[PDB]
Design a protein around this ligand. Structure first.
Ligand SMILES: [Mg+2]
Ligand SMILES: [Mg+2]
Ligand SMILES: [Mg+2]
Ligand SMILES: [Mg+2]
Ligand SMILES: [Mg+2]
Ligand SMILES: [Mg+2]
Ligand SMILES: [Mg+2]
Ligand SMILES: [Mg+2]
Ligand SMILES: [Mg+2]
Ligand SMILES: [Mg+2]
Lengths: 72, 133, 304, 128, 37, 520, 101, 132, 195
RNA sequence: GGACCUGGCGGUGCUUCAUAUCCCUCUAGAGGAGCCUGUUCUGUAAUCGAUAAACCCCGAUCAACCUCACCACCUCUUGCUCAGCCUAUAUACCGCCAUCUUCAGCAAACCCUGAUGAAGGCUACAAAGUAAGCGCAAGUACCCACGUAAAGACGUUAGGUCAAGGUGUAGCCCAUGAGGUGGCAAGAAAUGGGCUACAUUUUCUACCCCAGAAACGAUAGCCCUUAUGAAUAAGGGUCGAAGGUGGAUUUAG
């Protein structure tokens, strides 16, 4: 059922462990809470790949950085 | 009278790695015709016994999914028609079966499918313990 | 007509072909082998055997049709040809002759069977009058020729059993005799083992009935078999159950207890139980609901 | 759509309206009746707009013992074939629609002086 | 996509291989209507 | 590849050829439609992406001299290359890469005739940078597409400044020339090219025809090939077998080559030379001349691919069955009745004469019926042969029924085709035996058939014998109204009637006897 | 050549909703979140309000494939009840019979 | 009164085939399914796609073999393989038959990205089961 | 104009290689089949439809191929390729002793061109803790951590993995999770010691 | 105008029947009150159709926005469509069904009778009917051989459906077509089907049956919470009436 489509040799740890993608914010804030829940859901979701997950992550990063005016 | 002299035998190699051992191959064939399923499972068990492996058999119950539509087009709610899909299961269990035997047998059967059948394989393999534990 | 022999020889050839295919001695070969082979080679979910594929002997496939009843030209062979019912009337004439011969000396056969034995359609009234001739002939004496002539048509009565089967007793450890039986119901299936030497308490799934059935009518049903037999406190029973309805499980226990007691009990008392009517699975089950109406039988109000 | 399309016999049925109310009771119709037509027989499988020459069905496969290949029918040949098909359909429709001249017997719209030809032959064989 | 389906089948008809009887009927009645005005 | 039902069943070689060619034409039509409308099949519905199923893209991109040059070797044509050379020489005046120039020259030499002349005279403008590869590819092109003096000039120029390059050069030099051949071979072996023996194969192809003074040296050249130990002896061996062609068969060399090809068959083969297709056909051509059955059996894993074209397969099977017929023939007819559906006039003629020499009369009917079932119709050569061979016989009395049946079928086929005019001269040649067989049970058929024959004639001695036997086999008037008429027609029937009239014919009536007397 | 202009509209809606699917989900999560700033939730509400029409997955409808019938369609086969009954009676599809249970 | 995939009874001069003579409640009782796939079964999916491609190819080949067929199609999909089975008449030439077979096979293959094979049975004139 | 030759039925002999004439799955082709097999509802005073125009044979699946002789042939051919099972492994207790770690995946197969299906990712594994842990503190710890993945009636812990789309990814993640679970059950905490 | 054939009709006669149907009988219900959902009617700029039996939780196994086909307003003109049209015609149709049917008749092809007329063709201890074929039936499905489903022909209602889709005819083809904003979808009122209860066989508590308390009732309204959505539903607090078991008539078994 997977003759081809190996996800570019991706790895389970590359899918699940996003701590390396999580570097540009502390570990206590509400942005941290939100992104931790997001990473949880992503690791739970197998349908998408590490590519889509990192695009999601960069999306959130850029958005809350251009809306970084608050930090409340 | 025309009989070939030297039969072309394909190449085979016994790789240094050990083959994996499948504890139990439990296959489940779903169909519409119990006669088709009986012929198919007889075929399978005969091939397995000629290959020299044990075998078990049992027939799970027949499942049905039915639904109702309107018999007419515009206005008749009293009068409907019904339809149903009848699916029939047959389970084939094999024990103490080597990985290469699994490969050859499943390939044979997978080429030998009939048309209106689905085939659900469950492979159970026994393995040692990791090195990090 | 020659197509018949064509099909016969072709059928033999195909039979030999199939025997060679399946790998057996083509000479010794049977119709059950034929039918199993064609079922394995040509499965069919068709419900009717008439519609399922069949490779059968052509003599049995094609129905018998009357051959040419007259020669190449001129007269016919039989002497009733100019009327219908030639064979029927000839047979009735022969029967009348035999009957008057016996006079001067002094189960049945279905209409469809008679039709397919002959080569002509029949009528209800002529069938009735033929049966009347037969029975009035048999009312009086009959010789050997007449007896064999009548038995040529008379068929087997094929009587049924009209009796409740008996399961075999069994023996288990410490030399314990018993008898096991199984009962069913609408949606309840149970299996009960009766121990003869034992007596007193009764178990159900590991629980006694006194507290498993808070209601009294269930225990009344459980007691009805032993109460009728008079075998109340000398034989104990264990049982396991799987069902939804209370009264359903109760009736299942009743049937299983009776079917297990039939072994230990005498045949005459088994017959008494059958007459009592507690050894028959009631076929009644909740009817299907129909799509257009409100229930299994109730319809919406006809509003006029 | 292509899926919405369907076989032609039901189209002709629905267009003719042979049965359903017009026929029953003998009310009939005020002398209008659509005649069925068979386009399947009309044009052979070869005709198309782009007049590609098919050696398998449209052109003989071999010529002078030489294999053929796909080629193009130019505009002049295409319009020539189109005119040929138009005129052919015209003569087909002409031969279809014509007069019917049954010998006038006692009068028009009267079945008096007409003969049906000799009797029909018998089963044993008796030509009358 | 009925787009792909219908475009392919229209091109194939223009090729002259799939005799679409539905379109034949339609274009016949179209010709007759444009003849009758 | 062919269907299973009997109507679509191709029952002849030419029609089967046309059939699978129509199938290939449909395949080409499919290619055309897909490469004309790719967007329709662009959807990759299948989970495994397959370029074999993806639509095909020979579309030049936007003007881009470098990417256009890289796409040159992708498009596989010559107009793009002309335009690219134009754009690079006229306005740009620069080379994208020497490898690109080499590939352009490769393509243009492969594609090549005034067009070839122009393509070859438009390559000298190429930038000074022209290495060996360029020069030897120019030689390749000028050899395999144009005359040989140009290739020789290019080779001399290269010397002043590869295996199959020198192969093409030797082809050019060769295509009597003893000193030429010798010096060529000598300097070629002297150089360190170490060819793949394709040079040797080509020089053999050029030596296709010569006397012993080069046929026999080929044997020592092949022994040298074996000594160096390169050749599988797949094509050069077969070419020398063909060069053996011949006023007298050479049985010694024949046995030698039998043993050679015997060990070649014993060992397993691998293809290396594109010319192994003529191998099969010309090998069987030589086998047919040799005429040996153990030889045929020897010539008979996946080595059955070298047959290929239906023409070579036809020649092979024809010669094979011919040798088998002209070799008991029970095993031969067994092999035949086994391969007839798989296999596809001359072969049937050889079969008929083999059955004749065998005397197996009962087999010919089935063979004729099979030929008729397949494609035997609208030609009476084989009909004449079978009729003559079968009614030279009368020795089976019960088989006269089969005689009558096959005769009736032959006449049903004979009278099919009036419009063609070919059925008119068939009875004049072969009606005699047909009518004799019809006479041999039913007789009225043969009577009226001889009537039609004589009322179409070319009488014959066996025709006289037929008339006599028919007349003698009870009915004076019925015999007279035939024999007397044929006598009044021609003289030999009259000299036979002189005797026929003795028994009971002349006593009936004298008007016909008077006519006989007048004609006599 | 779709069946009708409403089918065309439905296809455009489906395509827009797909090509804006991820964004809609992300901003809807950012709206329905509870702990983040209410002003941020308001900004996200404004973003969703400024988004184009025919982009939400609610405006589309599970219409039929052939007859374009919105109602009376089975999600599995995607076909309308009339066409389903039609080709089932004709026995075109596989393993379906009348429920004479 | 119900009218569903059944023929109106005429005077008795109507040749009818088995499948259209029998009613739509004789499918499993006295008939077989024309198509054979697993999309209908439980656990699998893509049933809508199976059905739409079925009807498409049915109508396609019906319109590319006009006047030659004498029955509905029979489809046999064994895993990835596809097998078409038809019954036609011996009206046109084997040339045309084979050419159209190859053409349809190539088109189906390149369209559905599926391995396809086709088989057809020839008949002099379409069989008749009854005269309705 | 053209006429079809008579079928191969009379041509085929009684001695014949049915495995060779029907090696693989294919339609019925009555023209090639010699058997008079008919199938169809017989009409009053009638019989089923003859094999020639009886397309119901083609409607139904086909099993003329794959006869007992062909099965014997293929098994005799393929027994050269199949391997042998260890004779020492002849019981469930012995096999689970040799390799207590049981692991099983599964996947359906369906007719059609497409083959991918998300259920392919499913995998699970099973092991009895009676022999693997070799201690009691970590045993109590992990049996308290796991909610319902244990089963003491059977004395086996079982876990499922589908978080990753690939079967090999599921396998690797399950192995890593088991390893880290053992390593983290080895130790403890002070709030865990206080109970 | 006289005499007849067939059919319908008879508050037409005799006989035999009526299965939950005619009644007598049996039970439980509808017309009482509230509520949910349709229909009629009122108004609105605001779809459509069926609208006795054989419609009224009917097209719809769904209408907050697409669904939407209406309407006000704003734009497009070869317009996704080798155009399009939910524009008229179900009294042109196919396709799909209600219907008597809780029937058993319909009948090609022949023969005969009536003076060779419309028409009929029944007597079994037998006098002109023979009968293809269809259907009933049989058999198959579910748990049987019974039962329930399924099936149920020829035809009657120009029965319903051009709005599932297609299509003949007649029309718009700068529109009667297409696209996007908004609401449209309320009740002074009458009626239908269904839910709730009007009680102590009840209401509440744990179990579903050996107990203990009271001597009731909101799926309506107000407020709040949550489900999904970009923007009806379930739950919680309050309100604690009508209601006292039905006016002729009527339904199902
Ligand atoms: Mg109905
Ligand atoms: Mg007039
Ligand atoms: Mg929606
Ligand atoms: Mg809407
Ligand atoms: Mg409009
Ligand atoms: Mg109407
Ligand atoms: Mg019913
Ligand atoms: Mg029935
Ligand atoms: Mg009406
Ligand atoms: Mg919401």
């Amino acid at each position: 059922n997977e003759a081809g489509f190996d996800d570019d040799g991706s790895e389970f740890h590359e899918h699940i462990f996003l701590e390396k993608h999580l570097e540009s914010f502390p570990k206590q804030g509400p942005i941290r809470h939100f992104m931790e829940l997001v990473t949880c859901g992503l690791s739970k979701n197998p349908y998408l790949s590490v590519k889509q997950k990192v695009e999601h992550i960069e999306w959130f990063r850029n958005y809350f950085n251009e809306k970084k005016d608050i930090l409340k | 009278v025309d009989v070939p002299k030297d039969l072309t035998k394909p190449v085979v190699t016994i790789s240094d790695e050990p083959d994996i051992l499948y504890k139990r191959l439990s296959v489940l064939v779903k169909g519409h015709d119990k006669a088709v399923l009986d012929s198919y499972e007889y075929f399978a068990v005969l091939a397995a016994k000629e290959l020299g492996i044990s075998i078990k058999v049992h027939e799970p119950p027949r499942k049905i999914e039915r639904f109702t539509l309107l018999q007419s087009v515009h206005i008749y709610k009293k009068h409907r028609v019904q339809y149903e899909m009848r699916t029939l299961y047959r389970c084939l269990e094999l024990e103490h079966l080597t990985g290469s035997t699994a490969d050859v047998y499943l390939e044979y059967i997978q080429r030998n499918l009939p048309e209106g059948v689905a085939m659900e394989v469950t492979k159970t393999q026994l393995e040692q313990l990791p090195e990090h534990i | 007509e020659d197509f018949i022999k064509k099909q016969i020889e072709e059928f033999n050839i195909g039979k030999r072909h199939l025997a060679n295919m399946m790998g057996e001695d083509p000479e010794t070969f049977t119709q059950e082998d034929i039918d199993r082979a064609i079922a394995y080679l040509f499965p069919s979910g068709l419900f009717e055997k008439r519609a399922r594929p069949v490779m059968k002997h052509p003599e049995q496939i094609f129905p018998r049709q009357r051959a040419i009843q007259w020669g190449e030209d001129g007269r016919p062979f039989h002497y009733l040809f100019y009327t219908g019912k030639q064979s029927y009337y000839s047979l009735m004439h022969d029967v009348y002759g035999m009957l008057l011969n016996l006079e001067k000396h002094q189960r049945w056969l279905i209409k469809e069977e008679l039709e397919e034995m002959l080569v002509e359609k029949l009528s209800d009234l002529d069938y009735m009058q033929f049966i009347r001739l037969l029975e009035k002939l048999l009312t009086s004496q009959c010789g050997a020729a007449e007896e064999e002539f009548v038995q040529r048509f008379r068929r087997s009565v094929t009587l049924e059993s009209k009796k409740q089967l008996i399961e075999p007793v069994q023996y288990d450890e410490q030399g314990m005799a018993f008898s096991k039986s199984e009962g069913k119901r609408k949606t309840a299936k149970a299996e009960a083992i009766v121990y003869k030497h034992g007596s007193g308490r009764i178990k159900v799934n590991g629980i006694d009935y006194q507290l498993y059935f808070p209601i009294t009518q269930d225990r009344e049903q459980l007691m009805f078999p032993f109460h009728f037999v008079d075998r109340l406190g000398k034989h104990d029973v264990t049982c396991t159950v799987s069902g939804g309805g209370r009264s359903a499980q109760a009736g299942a226990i009743r049937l299983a207890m009776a079917k297990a007691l039939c072994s230990f009990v005498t045949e005459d008392e088994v017959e008494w139980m059958r007459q009592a009517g507690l050894l028959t699975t009631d076929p009644r089950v909740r009817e299907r609901k129909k799509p257009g109406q409100e229930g299994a039988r109730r319809k919406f109000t006809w509003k006029k | 759509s292509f899926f919405t399309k369907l076989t032609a016999d039901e189209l002709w049925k629905g267009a003719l309206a042979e049965t359903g109310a017009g026929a029953k009771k003998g009310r009939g119709k005020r002398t209008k009746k659509k005649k069925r037509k068979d386009l399947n027989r009309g044009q052979i499988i070869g005709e198309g707009r782009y007049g590609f020459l098919w050696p398998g069905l449209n052109v003989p496969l071999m010529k002078n013992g030489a294999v053929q290949t796909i080629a193009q029918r130019s505009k002049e040949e295409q319009e020539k074939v189109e005119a040929d098909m138009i005129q052919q359909r015209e003569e087909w429709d002409r031969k279809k629609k014509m007069k019917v001249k049954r010998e006038r017997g006692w009068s028009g719209n009267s079945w008096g002086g007409i003969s049906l030809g000799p009797p029909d032959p018998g089963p044993c064989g008796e030509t009358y | 996509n009925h787009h792909t389906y219908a475009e392919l089948m229209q091109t194939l008809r223009f090729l002259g291989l799939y005799r679409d009887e539905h379109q034949d009927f339609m274009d016949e009645q179209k010709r007759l209507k444009k003849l009758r005005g | 590849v062919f269907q299973d039902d009997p109507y679509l069943m191709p029952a002849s070689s030419l029609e089967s050829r046309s059939f699978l060619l129509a199938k290939k034409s449909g395949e080409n039509v499919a290619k055309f439609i897909i490469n004309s409308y790719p967007k329709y099949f662009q959807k990759d519905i299948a989970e495994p992406h397959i370029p074999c199923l993806m639509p095909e893209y020979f579309e030049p991109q936007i003007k881009d001299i470098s990417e256009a040059a890289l796409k040159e070797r992708i498009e596989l044509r010559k107009v793009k290359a002309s335009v690219d050379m134009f754009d690079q020489l006229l306005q740009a005046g620069t080379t994208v890469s020497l490898e690109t120039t080499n590939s352009l020259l490769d393509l243009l030499c492969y594609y090549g005739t005034w067009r070839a002349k122009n393509n070859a005279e438009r390559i000298f403008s190429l930038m000074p940078e022209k290495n060996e590869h360029s020069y030897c590819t120019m030689i390749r092109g000028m050899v395999k597409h144009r005359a040989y003096e140009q290739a020789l000039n290019l080779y001399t120029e290269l010397l002043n400044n590869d295996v199959y390059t020198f192969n093409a050069l030797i082809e050019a030099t060769v295509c009597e020339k003893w000193s030429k051949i010798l010096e060529l071979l000598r300097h070629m072996v002297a150089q360190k090219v170490k060819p793949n023996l394709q040079t040797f194969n080509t020089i053999l192809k050029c030596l296709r025809r010569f006397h012993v003074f080069a046929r026999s040296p080929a044997l020592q050249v092949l022994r040298e090939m074996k000594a160096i130990g390169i050749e599988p002896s797949l094509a050069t061996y077969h070419h020398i077998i063909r060069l053996f062609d011949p006023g007298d068969p050479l049985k010694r060399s024949s046995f030698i080559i039998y043993d050679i090809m015997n060990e070649l068959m014993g060992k397993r083969f691998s293809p290396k030379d594109p010319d192994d297709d003529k191998f099969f056909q010309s090998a069987m051509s030589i086998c047919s001349s040799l005429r040996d059955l153990e030889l045929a059996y020897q010539v008979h894993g996946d080595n059955w691919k070298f047959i290929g074209p239906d023409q070579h397969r036809n020649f092979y099977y024809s010669k094979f069955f011919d040798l088998i017929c002209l070799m008991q023939i029970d095993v031969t007819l067994k092999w035949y009745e086994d391969l007839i559906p798989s296999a596809y006039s001359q072969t049937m003629i050889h079969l008929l004469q083999a059955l004749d020499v065998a005397n197996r009369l009962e087999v010919i009917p089935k063979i004729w019926k099979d030929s008729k079932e397949y494609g035997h119709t609208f030609r009476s050569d084989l009909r004449e042969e079978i009729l003559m061979l079968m009614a030279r016989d009368k020795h089976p009395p019960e088989l006269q029924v089969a005689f009558a049946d096959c005769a009736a079928d032959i006449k049903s086929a004979y009278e099919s085709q009036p419009i063609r005019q070919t059925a008119q001269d068939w009875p004049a040649t072969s009606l005699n035996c047909i009518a004799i067989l019809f006479l041999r049970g039913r007789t009225q058929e043969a009577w009226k058939m001889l009537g039609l024959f004589r009322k179409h004639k070319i009488p014959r001695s066996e025709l006289l014998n037929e008339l006599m036997d028919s007349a003698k086999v009870n009915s004076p008037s019925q015999a007279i109204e035939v024999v007397e008429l044929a006598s009044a027609f021609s003289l030999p029937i009259c000299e036979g009637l002189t005797q026929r009239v003795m028994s009971d014919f002349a006593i009936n009536q004298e008007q016909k006897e008077a006519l006989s007397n007048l004609t006599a | 050549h779709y069946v009708d202009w409403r089918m065309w509209r439905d296809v455009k809606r489906r395509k827009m909703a797909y090509e804006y699917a991820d964004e809609r989900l992300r901003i809807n999560s950012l709206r329905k979140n509870t702990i983040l700033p209410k002003i941020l939730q308001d900004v996200a509400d404004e973003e969703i309000a400024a988004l184009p029409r025919d982009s939400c997955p609610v405006r589309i409808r599970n219409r039929c494939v052939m007859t374009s019938r919105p109602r009376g369609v089975k999600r599995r086969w995607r076909l309308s009840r009339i066409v389903f009954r039609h080709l089932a009676d004709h026995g075109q599809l596989s393993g379906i019979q009348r429920a004479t249970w | 009164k119900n009218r569903a995939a059944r023929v109106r009874v005429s005077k008795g001069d109507k040749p009818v085939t088995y499948e259209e003579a029998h009613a739509p409640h004789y499918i499993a009782h006295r008939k077989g399914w024309l198509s054979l796939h697993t999309g209908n079964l439980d656990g699998e999916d893509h049933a809508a796609e199976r059905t739409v491609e079925d009807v498409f190819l049915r109508k396609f080949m019906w319109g590319t073999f006009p006047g030659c067929l004498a029955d509905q199609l029979v489809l046999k999909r064994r895993g990835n393989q596809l097998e078409i089975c038809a019954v036609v008449l011996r009206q046109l030439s084997p040339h045309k038959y084979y050419f159209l077979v190859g053409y349809s096979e190539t088109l189906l293959s390149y369209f559905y990205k599926c391995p396809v094979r086709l088989h057809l049975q020839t008949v002099p004139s379409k069989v008749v089961y009854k005269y309705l | 104009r053209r006429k079809a030759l008579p079928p191969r039925t009379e041509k085929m002999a009684v001695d014949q290689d049915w495995p060779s004439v029907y090696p693989v799955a294919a339609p019925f082709k009555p023209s090639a089949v010699p058997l008079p097999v008919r199938m169809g509802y017989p009409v009053k005073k009638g019989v089923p439809m003859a094999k020639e125009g009886n397309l119901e044979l083609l409607k139904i699946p086909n099993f003329l191929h794959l006869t007992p002789v062909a099965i014997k042939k293929h098994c005799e051919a393929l027994k050269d390729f199949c391997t042998e099972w260890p004779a020492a492994l002849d019981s469930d207790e012995k096999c689970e002793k040799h390799f207590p770690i049981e692991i099983d995946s599964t996947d359906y197969v369906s007719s059609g061109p497409s083959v991918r299906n998300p259920r392919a990712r499913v995998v699970v594994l099973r092991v009895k803790l009676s022999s693997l842990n070799l201690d009691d503190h970590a045993k109590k710890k992990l049996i308290k951590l796991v909610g319902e993945r244990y089963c003491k009636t059977t004395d086996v812990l079982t876990i499922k993995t589908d978080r990753c789309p690939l079967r090999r990814q599921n396998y690797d993640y399950a192995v890593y999770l088991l390893t880290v679970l053992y390593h983290e059950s080895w130790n403890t905490e002070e709030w865990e010691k206080s109970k």
